Amino acid sequence: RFRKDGVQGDTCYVLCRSERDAGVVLARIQETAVPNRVHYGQLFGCSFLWASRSALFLCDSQLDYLPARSPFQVFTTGWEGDVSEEEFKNLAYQLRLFPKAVRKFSHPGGEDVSSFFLEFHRMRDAKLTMSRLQLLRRRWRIGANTPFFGFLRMADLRFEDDVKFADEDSAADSDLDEPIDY
RNA sequence: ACAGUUACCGUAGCUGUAGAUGAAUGCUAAUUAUAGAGUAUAUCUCCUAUGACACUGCAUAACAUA
16 A cells, blocks of 8 residues: 555555456456445445556566666557567567657566567657557557556655655656646 | 907806817819728618538558668
8 A cells, every 4th residue: 555745544555466367357347336434333334436447567677777767758568479679670560550769678587578668759749659559459459458558657765864855855847848738 | 268148236047169070961182102090880571502522630550771
């Protein structure tokens, strides 16, 4: 379970499963469910509608912390076919689709699935890419709930011998990179 | 801002004259080719057209490396 700024239990709860088969089965029936809220006076409390959906992932590796700090708009893609090169294989087939990525990276591990990274110049290009992928997913009949793509992010860290944490910084100006257009 | 209303004196009430030109009309002028601001101005009757051909995008997997 996560936590808010005031060390309060955040409503964001995360679960896991031993196997992979049951993963899909969890995010198909937990929609609009009202088990209970609180057990006081031997009776149930207020209602609450359940909503389960895959919208977040976690990764821990020794070759991911450094690469994910240089670019400002970094993408993540996975669920690819048999083992592939970057310059010779990933670039060439990219032309067919509409990725429009400045650079790319790899993700070893020795599994039967690859995951190549993407880079963008402006926030608008990144945003537009998201839509493209989403649309394509439907066409292919892959699955709504099936992880296909995501947005990479750097988790907040708190070091020592510091008067103020980075997350609690009020003078930060890391919002100008996201222009607003309407 | 000033004169007039029996050829005596207080009130009261009238004509001409100022500016603002956000209507209409009469006479006379189309006279080099550097001519302007605002609801772009109101009521009622008959008939015709609109309504599937409206802007943009194939980056809507295109024109695709000796």
